[PDB]
Design a protein around this ligand. Structure first.
Ligand SMILES: *[C@@H]1O[C@H](CO)[C@@H](O[C@@H]2O[C@H](CO)[C@@H](O[C@@H]3O[C@H](CO)[C@@H](O)[C@H](O)[C@@H]3O)[C@H](O)[C@H]2NC(C)=O)[C@H](O)[C@H]1NC(C)=O
Lengths: 174, 54
């Protein structure tokens, strides 16, 4: 089913982001953002590549298939031949169309799941000092620079370095 | 029987694959259309006939 991220609680995509599928957008003391997340997008590329190659290699190529000939006293066999060809053609066209239609919902839900998990990870490693504000943004009670940005990105945040100082600012706003 | 191509007679045509070794004998007293050339066949499958105007 729909996991709720793409065109969900997160609004439309980012045109300005180029080198990936899933990324961040940061505004510390000296810049704006648009950096991609090269870890998760590589797993997505691997999954999709394996999927397409599997769908290609399940379908065998056909060899030579040439029509046959019958005279006017072999109408019965000729109708049988036509029945066999039309039956197999209907079966294969059904299989092809149905396979593509199901595979498309599978892949769109796969991307949706990836975005939701990439959001939950960032939320989980910023437990207290964040104050999420809407459509997947956070806001750092403490002060952050480029190093803590990369520290968030990699997945190594070390929360107890900042845990006291944030607390002060939180009690300032409350 | 009625004429076709200005002829009232008819003619029937026949064919047979021999094997290596084995012989064949024609023996006739009135109507033989004898063979005058024949064909020795190779192999190599997956061919056919195409009706096209390309
Ligand atoms: C994920 O991000 C962390 C950053 O938290 C990366 O660790 C960092 O590695 C860089 C390498 O440029 C360190 O920067 C520089 O280190 C040298 C050598 O000590 C120093 O001379 C420079 O002045 C500068 O500090 C950075 O300090 C270090 N992290 C820390 C503790 O700040 C990490 O490599 C990235 N990758 C992974 C998977 O962690």
């Amino acid at each position: 089913g729909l996991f709720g991220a793409i065109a969900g609680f997160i609004e439309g995509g980012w045109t300005g982001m180029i080198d990936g599928w899933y990324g961040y957008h940061h505004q510390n003391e000296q810049g704006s953002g648009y950096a991609a997340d090269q870890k998760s997008t590589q797993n997505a590329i691997d999954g999709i590549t394996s999927k397409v190659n599997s769908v290609i290699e399940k379908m065998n190529t056909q060899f030579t298939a040439v029509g046959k000939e019958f005279n006017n006293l072999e109408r019965r066999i000729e109708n049988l031949n036509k029945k066999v060809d039309d039956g197999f053609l209907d079966v294969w066209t059904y299989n092809a169309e149905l396979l593509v239609l199901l595979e498309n919902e599978r892949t769109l839900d796969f991307h949706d799941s990836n975005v939701r998990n990439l959001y939950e990870k960032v939320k989980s490693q910023l437990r207290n000092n964040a104050k999420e504000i809407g459509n997947g943004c956070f806001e750092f009670y403490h002060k952050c620079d480029d190093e803590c940005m990369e520290s968030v990105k990699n997945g190594t945040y070390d929360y107890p370095k900042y845990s006291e100082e944030s607390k002060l600012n939180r009690e300032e706003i409350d | 029987r009625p004429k076709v191509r200005g002829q009232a007679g008819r003619m029937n045509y026949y064919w047979t694959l021999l094997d290596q070794g084995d012989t064949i004998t024609f023996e006739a007293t009135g109507n033989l259309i004898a063979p005058w050339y024949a064909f020795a066949l190779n192999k190599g499958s997956d061919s056919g006939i195409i009706t096209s105007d390309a």
